[PDB]
From Swiss-Prot, chains A, B, C, D, E, F, G:
Organism listed in the record: Pseudomonas aeruginosa (strain ATCC 15692 / DSM 22644 / CIP 104116 / JCM 14847 / LMG 12228 / 1C / PRS 101 / PAO1)
The protein's name in its UniProt record: Bacterial ferritin
GO molecular function: ferric iron binding; ferroxidase activity; heme binding; iron ion binding; iron ion sequestering activity
UniProt-listed Gene3D superfamilies: 1.20.1260.10
EC number: 1.16.3.1
Coiled-coil ranges per UniProt: none
PROSITE patterns for the chain: BACTERIOFERRITIN, FERRITIN_LIKE
InterPro entries: Bacterioferritin, Ferritin-like, Ferritin-like_diiron, Ferritin-like_SF, Ferritin_DPS_dom
Keyword flag Transmembrane helix: no
Annotated Gene Ontology cellular component terms: cytosol
Enzyme class: oxidoreductase
Length: 154, 154, 154, 154, 154, 154, 154
């Protein structure tokens, strides 16, 4: 019935982080669309939808463990150029990865293995999809130049 | 091109209000699903998406007018019982309706008729769909009793 | 080529009665819809359309008998609560029943057998569908209580 | 919630005007049909249905603004000849057009923009479909002759 | 039956402006096609057809208001290079935007609300599609260079 | 590569003549449509589209010959009555027919046979479709009467 | 039956030129495919087939006129770089265009109008398709640079 308060409180820290991540992707994707980079809009819009699902999974788990979800998003750090927005989004995923890894350890100490399994799925997406794609973008800019990279994102 | 600063700031005021309304629906809908009221989950889940669409419309208009969107949501005031959560949502929508109506008058005053037309569509949804449904729910409770109303929301 | 003036005048009295019934069903169905009882709205909106077809048959018969139709509907008295609106409709239907039965006898005495037949079909609908349905609703309210009845009409 | 009494009251004036318009198109279409002018009947039968929809919109709007809809239709002024009936319907459309325009102005003054938007849609129909068609019918009679026009309406 | 002469005259000024815009899009799209930029041809050929539909709506409204349309298009000044043609189109669209906004205010002051509505839809297309697209192209040229931009328009 | 200046110049004279023809069919078709003559509107709307295509062919031909297309339409001379509008369009077709014939001769003299072939196709249309139809309409009015002709064009 | 000897010899002159043009496209298209420019291979492969069709048309006309076709192709002058190969093809097509135009004049002089019409179709393809496309390619290179142009031909 009732989850551990240490676990519940840490899930809430991740929830406010994921609500923030969803809103950062929201603004970035619409700035990308405003500038005419439709391929950057579509990928970031998809990531915004995925963060809503990640936050949803955490929200419902907190309610199941009888906790009170914290719905105030943490602050966001939007950039002003494509290289900057890509870097800010990679730094976000890096903080998310560290926080998710520490929550997985915490769930193991408190023997909340179902909450660990939920965090592990989100960590996989963070490393193998989000952060992986973002490092590809930055490495392509370095290899083909910003003019060519931006042209390909129209 | 560039909009009037007063119109852009007011659009940003409506944007932080709608980002908050979307988050109030997120929590309310998931509380409803956790309690097992699937019809209230589905309505309020649909309303959260519609608010995300409303916020996206404001967000893209602010960017088109060369403005900077404010992404920190307003404070939310969730409820703890179905009557409270419905009243809190009704109170939110009354505020949004007054705010959109004042924004429509302002847009007319500064001759930004496209911004006016975007707000008019949102004002229609607020009165004819959101506020209309919530007042129906509160009227149903008063007429059939909370026990019967909650049973019909399973 | 021309009908009896007594029969024309009575078809006209029936016509203004049926235009009134259509408009009472018009307002009652929309009040039911506004309160959120969609099954009551759907049933009363269908009875509105049936009254318009009933009025239409009398209107065309009056013109075929070389008469001039009276288009001013009778005054209506809608209720303000579900029990009052059901009683107001049952009262109207009972007057319509007696008016139709009186006109059938009038048509039989003036040997207008086609006008008698038009009125019998309307009488049969008035008795076997409308008043029967209304009498059922009032019986159900007494058996299951108004609260359960309204819940079932959502 | 609660609309402005001046608005609710003016919507009720338009409502009785529109219920009368529906009944004038009712009698005209059936007279046309009795005379054998099927094309005039279909068109005016279609306008009766459109006027019923316009009335529904106003009635549901009055109920949302917490008002009491008035169901007594205004007086109708039918014609006895095709030229007269056409002229009668145009006069009604012209009166309706002026009525809707004053209400649009009144709604703006009281800041009920949704009620205005409902009225603008009806005004567009009154001007771009109804009155346009009537004026066309009258110009056609002037150019090709009534005998020819009526033949074409068969 | 008749419109205000001031509104008729302003719709006429708008009409000659939109006939001109159609013919500028006509020549620009064909120059783009001749140079081998098929994506620029397809986009500008579609905007040509939209201007003809815009001109058509004004032309019919002028005739409905009992006015006489002015069919002499305004003079146009097409460019000779891709950057000049994009700037020439953006300049025209900015004048069209201001002319439409001025006519909307004119229609509101003379209570011609249907003519106001026709103009708003054209304003919305002028701002949210045309000028938005043109401003995007000029932004892309600055980010990726004219050489890459033209290659992408082949 | 480079066409003969006398040819390029004469194609530009035909171009402005054809852009004017497109605009005359534009206003005529919409006047016919405003009056309720749907068959005349469809036919003349179709001719406006065919004239736009004829203009496209000349414009693309001028661009291939490395010339600069002239986009200022010639003056148009619309009528106010059906008989006058028909006569006006025939006069225009007759002027166009003579113009196209002189150009065909000019192209042969300068040995640009492709430009001649484009012109012969347009001449065939001008004579075998456009002028033929107009003459038919006028002969019909003479035989069956204008009242009957107009009825048939409804 | 039998054609004029001067017309037959000129057709044979055009035939050896077109058999050469077909072979120049064969080598050029296969050089393009070997370098990996598949879009240039496919266009120039299609042009080789079209020239084979043009030669077949001349061949069959010469036989029908009781002539003897000359099957030795003219000398070809292939290029060694994409700019050279495009220029060499443009130079070839200019020669064919002048040769077909002179042949059309000759056919008219000897009143062989069918032979003229066969040459007119080939002259149209030469100017409007072959030469038009090649000048587009050279213009694209001048506008986007050879590196970008060659990339787009992969």
């Amino acid at each position: 019935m009732q989850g551990h308060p240490e676990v519940i409180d840490y899930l809430n820290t991740l929830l406010t982080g994921e609500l923030a991540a969803r809103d950062q992707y929201f603004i970035h994707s619409r700035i990308y669309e405003d500038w005419g980079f439709s391929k950057l809009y579509e990928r970031l819009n998809h990531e915004m939808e995925e963060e809503t699902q990640h936050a949803d999974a955490l929200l419902r788990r907190i309610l199941l463990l009888e906790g009170t979800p914290r719905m105030r998003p943490d602050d966001i750090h939007p950039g002003t150029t494509v290289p900057e927005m890509l870097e800010a989004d990679l730094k976000l995923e890096r903080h998310v990865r560290a926080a998710l890894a520490k929550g997985i350890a915490l769930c193991e100490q408190h023997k909340d293995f179902v909450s660990r399994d939920i965090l592990l799925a989100q960590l996989r997406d963070t490393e193998e999809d989000h952060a992986y794609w973002l490092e590809q973008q930055l490495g392509l800019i370095a290899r083909i130049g910003l003019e060519n990279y931006l042209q390909s994102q129209m």
